[PDB]
DNA sequence: AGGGCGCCTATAAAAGGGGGTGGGGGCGCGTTCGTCCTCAGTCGCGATCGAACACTCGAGCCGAGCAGACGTGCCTACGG
């Protein structure tokens, strides 16, 4: 059970962008430092980097007191955008080995760490302890390969994906800088996980699929309801211009569709007119709005449009998505293939063009039929096992390489 | 107790059975070989079932056009 932060659950901006142009899609999950137009750090010259130690201790203390003040047990702390800052709480880094994994979290979403352990035969004294995560004793593997007896494997686990992770040490040279309009802050950060290839648990839709079109529609609908809720006017009213600015690729006519059932156009002598909430229309509750569209569904959709943009950039037209190698790497194909195989509907290529590492240390998620048929499945498991073990060994290794001069 | 007289030894030849010994043939029984049958396995042929592909129909979405309303500008008429 995953409980996301309130800003994420509410699909607030900027945590959940309403629109992304080509540039943003290319930079998806890699935001570049952009200059500020105003505020302290818009100014030239040196700027102080501030310590956070007193602040970190204080927030931990305040949070624990709030915990004891009601009057123990479990509390949920991620209620406001302010609670999501890197400025307090314990922090880890996670570095993703896939250049563009099929699903990624937005800021404000939650994930668990699970410590998968397989018992040694006979008298097992229990799993080793880890600094992070909750131990899970598993007789069957949640991955493509099987755990060996006595093997502990850490992993990220959420509704988008499961992925093995490997704990490493941050280099002694490195610090985390947090940057706001107001100043820089610095934190020590020692724990950094390498993330291995994802096992997708959520299916990414194809471009212009019914699923995709239903999603943008519903997301637009949610944004609209939230606009009415934000309005302080009675009767509530919103401006077309504000919707168009958030959804610049929607025609005014398609926006009028979403508005015709809940609101009335009020014309004024000025090129700004209002849509006023109908007096017999009951605005959906917070709880009902949340049920309309989940953060996971937004993540699936984002994955599609970003991939679609990268494909266009590489010369692959919409008619391409009998199929080109590059199109096989698309998240709508890889997630579909992996999930089908998880349900026993087919097997996976494993060795193939969709291996995200390009060098045999990752899996190619491409459907092959279940179609000597005990040898067919034993060969699939053997190959899965080999790559599974290879990935764990390479990504957990502390060996120092050796810059490639090419 | 001893002399003579009986028998043995050797020679030829015939008569005919009968008896004895050895070899061959015939007859009967058993063994071996061949043929047939049965069983099992494999291959081929035919029929039936399942899967895949194609075609048709319906629904939805998008776009374009028209109408209405509002605002602004220009011209004409009315009022002071």
Q: Which residue is nearest to nucleotide B69 (CA to C1')?
A: A267
Distance from residue A156 (CA) to nucleotide B23 (C1'), in Å?
115
Distance from residue A366 (CA) to nucleotide B58 (C1'), in Å?
34
Approach to solving: cryo-EM
Distance from residue A329 (CA) to nucleotide B33 (C1'), in Å?
79
A269 touches strand B (CB under 7 A): yes
Distance from residue A370 (CA) to nucleotide B53 (C1'), in Å?
21
A272 touches strand B (CB under 7 A): no
A372 touches strand B (CB under 7 A): no
C-beta separation of A165 from A94 below 8 A: yes
Q: Which nucleotides of B are covered by protein (CB under 7 A)?
A: 61-65, 69-72
**Rounded distance, CA A344 to CA A212, Å?**
25
Distance from residue A6 (CA) to nucleotide B8 (C1'), in Å?
163
For A59, A240, A401, the CA distances from A404, given in Å and listed in that order, are 44, 55, 9
Distance from residue A265 (CA) to nucleotide B22 (C1'), in Å?
153
A251 touches strand B (CB under 7 A): yes
For A70, A117, A124, A166, A400, the CA distances from A128, given in Å and listed in that order, are 33, 9, 11, 15, 26
A268 touches strand B (CB under 7 A): yes
A182 token code pair: 């107001």
A397 touches strand B (CB under 7 A): no
Distance from residue A20 (CA) to nucleotide B23 (C1'), in Å?
131
A62 token code pair: 């305040």
Nucleotide nearest A273, CA–C1', reads B70
Nucleotide nearest A270, CA–C1', reads B71
A213 touches strand B (CB under 7 A): yes
- CA dihedral for A55, A57, A60, A66, sign (positive or negative): negative
**Rounded distance, CA A64 to CA A316, Å?**
54
**Rounded distance, CA A83 to CA A104, Å?**
21
A209 touches strand B (CB under 7 A): no
Q: Edge to edge, what strands does the sheet with A263-266 contain?
A: A237-239, A274-277, A263-266
Among candidate residues A198, A159, A179, the one with its CA nearest the CA of residue A2: A159
A371 touches strand B (CB under 7 A): no
Reduce the secondary structure of chain A to three states and give it as a string: CCCCCHHHHCCCCCCCCCCCCHHHHHCCCCCCCCCCCCCHHHCCCCCCEEECHHHHHHHHHHHHHHHHCCCCCCCCCCCCHHHHCCCCCCCCEEEECCCCCCCCCCCCCCCEEEEEECCCCCCCCCCCCCCCCEEEECCCCCCCCCCCCCCEEEEEECCCEEEEEEEEECCCCCCEEEEECCEEEEECCCEEEEECCCEECCCCCCCCCHHHHHHHHHHHHHHHHHHHHHCCCCCCEEEHHHHHHHCCCCCHHHHHHHHHCCEEEECCCCCCCEEEECCCCCCCCHHHHHHHCCHHHHHHHHHHHHHHHHHHHCCCCHHHCCCCHHHHCCHHHHHHHHHHHHCCCCEEEECCCCCCCCCCCCCEEEEECCCCHHHHHHHHHHHHHHHHHHHHHHHHCCCCCCCCCC
Distance from residue A304 (CA) to nucleotide B28 (C1'), in Å?
107
Distance from residue A253 (CA) to nucleotide B65 (C1'), in Å?
13
Distance from residue A252 (CA) to nucleotide B15 (C1'), in Å?
169
């Amino acid at each position: 059970i995953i409980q996301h932060s309130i800003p994420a659950v509410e699909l607030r901006q900027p945590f959940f962008p309403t629109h992304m142009g080509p540039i943003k899609l290319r930079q998806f999950h890699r935001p570049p430092l952009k200059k500020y137009s105003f505020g302290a750090l818009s100014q030239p010259g040196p700027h102080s980097v501030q310590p956070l130690l007193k602040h970190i201790k204080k927030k931990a203390k305040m949070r624990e007191q709030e915990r004891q003040a009601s009057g123990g047990g479990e509390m949920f702390f991620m209620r406001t955008p302010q609670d999501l800052t890197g400025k307090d709480g314990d922090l880890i880094l996670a570095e993703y080995s896939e250049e563009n994994g099929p699903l990624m979290m937005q800021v404000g979403m939650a994930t668990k760490i699970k410590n998968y352990y397989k018992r040694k035969p006979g008298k097992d004294p229990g799993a080793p302890d880890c600094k992070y995560g909750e131990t899970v004793y598993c007789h069957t593997s949640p991955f493509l390969g099987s755990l060996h007896p006595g093997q502990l494997l850490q992993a990220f686990e959420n509704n988008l994906f499961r992925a093995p992770i490997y704990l490493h040490k941050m280099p002694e040279t490195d610090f985390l800088i947090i940057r706001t309009r107001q100043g820089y802050y610095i934190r020590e950060l020692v724990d950094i996980f390498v993330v291995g290839q994802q096992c997708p648990l959520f299916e990414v839709p194809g471009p212009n699929s019914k699923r995709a079109n239903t999603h943008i529609r519903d997301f637009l609908q949610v944004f609209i309801y939230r606009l009415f809720w934000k309005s302080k006017d009675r009767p509530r009213r919103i401006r077309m211009e504000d919707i168009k600015k958030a959804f610049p690729s929607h025609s005014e006519s398609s926006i009028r569709k979403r508005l015709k059932l809940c609101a009335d156009f009020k014309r004024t002598g000025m090129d700004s007119n209002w849509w006023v909430l109908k007096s017999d229309f009951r605005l959906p509750t917070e709880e009902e709005i949340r049920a309309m569209v989940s953060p996971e569904q937004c993540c699936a959709y984002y994955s599609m449009i970003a991939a679609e943009q990268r494909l266009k950039d590489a010369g692959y037209g919409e008619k391409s998505f009998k199929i080109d190698d590059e199109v096989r790497t698309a998240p709508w194909n890889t997630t579909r293939a992996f999930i089908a195989a998880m349900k026993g509907k087919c097997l996976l290529e494993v060795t193939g063009v969709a291996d995200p590492t390009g060098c045999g240390e990752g899996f190619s998620y491409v459907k092959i039929p279940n179609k000597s048929v005990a040898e067919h499945q034993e060969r699939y498991k053997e190959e899965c096992q080999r790559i599974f073990d290879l990935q764990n060994k390479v990504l957990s290794s502390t060996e120092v390489l050796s810059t490639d001069t090419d």
